[PDB]
Structures are given as C-alpha cells and as structure tokens.
DNA sequence: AGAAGTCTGACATCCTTACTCAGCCAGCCCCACACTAGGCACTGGAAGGTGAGTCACTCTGGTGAGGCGATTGCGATTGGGTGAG
C-alpha cells in the first residue's frame, strides 16, 4: 500500500485500523482508490430578512445571489 | 325827466267735424325662414390591468463508469509412489 501510494497508483486512508498507535497519532497504510416550492417563494427580499434573523454573516447576505 | 320792460287787454288765424275721392307711402301685425351657439353624443386616444410567455434554478431521472470483489485459472510446492542401485 505505501509503495503504491508513493508511485501515485492509489491513496491510503490515513485514519483506519492499520494505525500502529491505536489512537489518532500515526498513519495507516491500506489502499483506497483515488476515485423547495415555498423556498423559491421567499422572493429574495424576505429570504434576506430571514438570513438577517438567523444570524448569518453579512457577506452571504451581501452577495445578493438569490 | 326820459326811456324801459313787461302786462293786462283787445283782436286774428286756423285747430275742431268733415265729405270725398282720388293717387301713393309710413307705420304695425303676423309671421318665414334662418341662424348662431352651445348641449349632447360619438369617436378616438391613453392608461391600466390581466394574461401569457420566457428566463433561471432546482430537482429528478437516466446513463455511464467504476468498483471492489468474488470467482476462476494457472503456477508452484509438497507429498507419495515407484524404480533403480
């Protein structure tokens, strides 16, 4: 698994059971493959006011991307 | 004492009624178009509302690719049997 990952054949799940620590420290070398109706009726403006009400940050409110 | 501006007083004409019978107009009555100006109606234009179509986004379905994974095939190793010394 590790030598195949070094050639770029495949990837390795770095968290797994092959982990020699048994905790989150250390890697595991085993192969993984490399491979609304009423919401549309919010009619942008009221959805903007709803995002203001929930506490969504002003950047997302500002974008104005319906 | 001489002129002046009225002033009662003593006449002088053409109103009346009036025929009459002329020939021609002026002044009213009773309307004829006739006519002007604006009320009513019609037409046109503008505005507003509704309906339809299009655009964008999201969801669902279909197709493709992968995917891992089992199954099959091949190769290698081990064991057993037979033959030879």
């Amino acid at each position: 698994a590790f030598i195949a990952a070094m050639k770029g054949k495949c990837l390795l799940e770095v968290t797994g059971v092959a982990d020699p620590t048994g905790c989150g420290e250390g890697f595991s070398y085993v192969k993984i493959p490399n491979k609304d109706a009423d919401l549309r009726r919010l009619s942008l403006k009221n959805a903007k006011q709803l995002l203001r009400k929930f506490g969504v940050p002003e950047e997302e409110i500002k974008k104005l991307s319906r």
Side-chain angles (χ1 to χ4, degrees), chain A residues 2-55:
Chain A
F2 190 80
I3 298 170
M6 290 335 271
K7 340 204 206 326
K9 238 193 67 173
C10 58
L11 300 188
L12 309 181
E13 43 165 40
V14 283
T15 172
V17 309
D19 181 275
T21 293
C23 317
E25 306 140 349
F27 311 88
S28 90
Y29 304 140
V30 281
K31 293 187 188 172
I32 216 63
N34 21 357
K35 273 300 150 339
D36 215 71
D38 242 321
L39 277 126
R40 300 258 96 219
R41 295 181 250 154
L42 284 188
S43 66
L44 185 59
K45 182 256 187 179
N46 293 318
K48 176 177 170 67
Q49 289 181 356
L50 285 174
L51 292 181
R52 182 55 188 252
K53 188 174 182 179
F54 285 114

Side-chain angles (χ1 to χ4, degrees), chain A residues 48 51-63:
Chain A
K48 176 177 170 67
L51 292 181
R52 182 55 188 252
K53 188 174 182 179
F54 285 114
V56 176
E58 289 292 327
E59 183 68 26
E60 180 65 30
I61 304 170
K62 187 261 291 180
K63 299 180 299 60

